[PDB]
């Protein structure tokens, strides 16, 4: 049994032309466009030849240069239009109208491909390990988060899902039952502001799915913490998502994050790195019972 | 009377054009252009500045070649008149306005949020059965697309008539169904088709409704899903509705998740399918009293 | 002392070029554009005349037709470009680049003006009177809401502000102190779905600013209920706002809305109309005290 | 060390271009076009299909007239070569890509959300004083524009260092300041400049901080306001920051609202202004203990 979300953000789960085109390399992309235009010019060029209104046209090649010069609106005036036919005068209209729509679509896509905010999502980095340790009387599940590029994407919001197999009192099996892990939702502390990389901290309370799990129970647990971080880029109001996961073994008990902060200079080497201090090995449940 | 939202989610001067079908959208535009070319072509003829123009037809080819900015140079402009030099300006400016309406209509017609979430599907039925002691109304949602949805989120309303103690009748009362609102669990991480659960508690409009009352009842659950397309800046939306007959009592969804060679296989044939299980005939209210004693 | 928000949605309170242009009539709008283009053609036409590379140009008028034919990219070829000068060849570049930006800006605006969702906000209608009456044991402040056009804008969300003069224990005067009136926020019942016109219902509870006010107290009260309704149009994901107000005298005690529903045919005449039934004249506070 | 957000809200291949100043934005583009015209012009010369072309300069005017789609017809295309007929296609297609980047950069550069809320202003100072028994941190926000903001909403974070009982130091702890989140009162109806209030209760990071501690403290309040421009589909945003010295203790905002002939007059000179009032020297915590006994 392997994981459901990989550290980078791909799902290990199998099943708008714009959204097709964005996922395509420039190799393949440039190519869509050239074709889409040629096939219109081929199509319309063939209709001029079916119309033979035309000036200086001698072969197949001559009708092409016109079709293009008409649709692109160049019109050198070596190949002009006359009045002797009804059919050619009206084709030019249907062409120039359609030559507008096909253009708009292509530029719409061309923009959507370049506008895509998928690039900004790359510098968004998650810590490699999640750590459970004590923090102000309470046992806290913690992980780091931030951006590798300082300028853009400071505003964001974190959420976390917990995926585990489940069986109900009634016996129904829920394979990937997810429940939301509170990373600051009720307070508005999940609305992040990534000046620097921040430690996101889930407080292990009575509502926490980690309530009754101790240091010993932990590795003997088949759970996965999915982490979704979505933020708005600084130069553009366009927002992008970023995911990483944490399987059971990826969570270190008794550990605490290595502070990356030292003018303010941010040390990106220490980012993923963690250290352990003396931390109770007990479930947050039993710690709270003995606290009372 | 009928429903208000169909299974496919559809309900029962610029907006007018984007609401139209493509087939017509283009047809209107063709007219819209001809009528500008007719109008402006007629003004060139009223101006007769012109070169090689002989009849009505000749002024047209110019009007078009001017507005489309082709200009073959068989029909050029001279200087002898004031009127023609300035018309060309008013034409070329107005030729941008018309163009903008078209591209405007494009961008909008395509990037509408119904057309983005077309890959999001809702299960054909809702089901009412027991989950961990609580009676639950459930339906299934799923993305066929691998292109995930940013800030995906579920919500549902119940459209049923009701009457107050004071004798006030509300013909089409709407009360929101909780589908994870208070916990955050209504913000979906939607990869595998999820089974959304409304826990029929005290606050549920389904609190008092039993197995034998279910068919006799007259109501409509509307299910709405809004996120953002990961790749575009534009929103996606998926609606669906469950009328009283599509809400199966005492049934469960067939699991769509299987482990197949370092990957998990989702069977979308099983997506809609449901199976019957032993489930109480009482309302969630009446079960609460039984368990209370 | 008059109101702060008028029934239509204007504020009785005194104090991006796109947002300037949207508010302008087509009379004035068409006009901005024509000017913006002429002034570029005048400017660039004058630079061709400063350059005198040119073919068949005789007066001021001749340089204009070129400047236009170059910027609009027409180029009839009665006025072509030669090679004898460095200056003209490079101007054409600066023109065609700037002739792109000035165009883009104009079409950007032209779209933003037509795309404006201000029109859809018109058919959005509010009831003329707000009514306080009993509804399932509880005293409820109620008002109607809906769209005059059936097709578009069914999804919306209601919120309500309450504006009243205020003075703190410490003596600070807050002239237009607003507090949010719960019209279904905590439940998600404020997320409307306007199949038909709906009665929005504020439950007068211990949190309600109308808690301690009875039928007698009501007219002797200097309060205003601001009502913001914002919804997304059906054909376009573009969303628009719509406001109406309710001053103290606009709220009828003992009254209940006339049901507009009777296939389903919606009776838009009865929309604003209301009727009174036997309703307790007591503050929701004292009614709850005697209920216990 | 310095702040992270300035008073004006600004902090301390495509995104690279939209982040640039206009002056440069255009300059880059001029190059971007010349280098395409140079490149393609050189391919026409490598092709030498051409009419009236004599030197290097002649191939340029064509390359441009072809890419810009001008085409004067002094330099036309013939049929004798295969190579030239097909280059023109690759050129005219690639001439759209470059154009799209430019318009792309336009649309984006202008409709960025900082540039929309430029009319939203924040008060220069924050103030800490008493309101209806509760100690309150307040700041003022205001729209100079009459064009209102759809779904306007306030939020604030406090950037202060702290240390846990277990000896864990958090260099730049962020804890959200409540400015109406739980009630809905953080959704602003923003016409008149509002005085946003954080009630310094048990949950406030300012709970324990007194008058004499205030200056000695090292923290940063960040204030963020997001709504939508009523007229455009695009978002607007206003940031500002209040460093420890901009938070006046025991002060109050001067009222900006006056009744003047069937209308109300807002004085924006008074917007930023504050006045001192008798206010306790204790923390909101210590006042709570005094009142408790
Ligand atoms: C014009 O310039 C682009 C040029 C051509 O790009 P080309 O045709 O080789 O294809 C792209 C190229 O491989 C990029 O490096 C990719 O970005 P990433 O770094 O692999 O993500 C991009 O993927 P994405 O941009 O679709 O992700 C590919 O589409 O690239 C130098
Ligand atoms: C091309 O067609 C438009 C044509 C000319 O419009 P014109 O120049 O007279 O100015 C517009 C006209 O008065 C509309 O009726 C107005 O809409 P509304 O109904 O008053 O709101 C519009 O305001 P808004 O659209 O800016 O509100 C005005 O700008 O109008 C027939
Ligand atoms: K052209
Ligand atoms: K041309
Ligand atoms: K020509
Ligand atoms: K031409």
Quick rundown:
By secondary structure, chain A is α+β, with helices and mostly antiparallel strands. Chain A has helices at residues 18-22, 26-50, 60-71, 86-115, 284-291, and strands spanning 13-14, 124-126, 130-135, 138-147, 155-167, 173-181, 191-193, 198-203, 223-232, 239-247, 251-253, 255-257, 274-276. Chains A and D meet through helix 2, helix 3, helix 4, strand 3 and strand 7 of A and helix 1, helix 4, strand 5, strand 7 and strand 8 of D.
Radius of gyration of chain A, in Å, reads 30 Å
Strand content of chain A: 25-35%
Ions, cofactors, ligands: which are bound?
Answer: the ligand CCCCCCCC(=O)OC[C@H](COP(=O)(O)O[C@@H]1[C@H](O)[C@H](O)[C@@H](OP(=O)(O)O)[C@H](OP(=O)(O)O)[C@H]1O)OC(=O)CCCCCCC, potassium ion
CATH class of the largest domain in chain A: Mainly Beta
Which architecture of the largest domain in chain A per CATH? Sandwich
Task: Assign the CATH superfamily of the largest domain in chain A.
Answer: G protein-activated inward rectifier potassium channel 1
Distance between the termini of chain A: 40 Å
Q: Give the largest interface pair and sizes.
A: A-B, 61 and 71 residues
The CATH topology of the largest domain in chain A: Immunoglobulin-like
Shape of chain A: elongated
Helix content of chain A: 25-40%
Query: What multimeric state do the chains show?
Result: homotetramer
The helix/strand series of chain A, from N terminus to C terminus, equals EHHHHEEEEEEEEEEEEH
- The figure for the number of domains of chain A is 2
Q: How large is the count of helical segments of chain A?
A: 5
Structural class of chain A: alpha+beta
Main pleated-sheet profile of chain A: 5 strands, mixed
Number of distinct beta strands of chain A? 13
PDB class: metal transport
Keywords: ion channel, potassium channel, inward rectification, sodium binding, PIP2 binding, G protein binding, metal transport
Assembly: tetrameric
Entry title: Crystal structure of the G protein-gated inward rectifier K+ channel GIRK2 (Kir3.2) R201A mutant in complex with PIP2
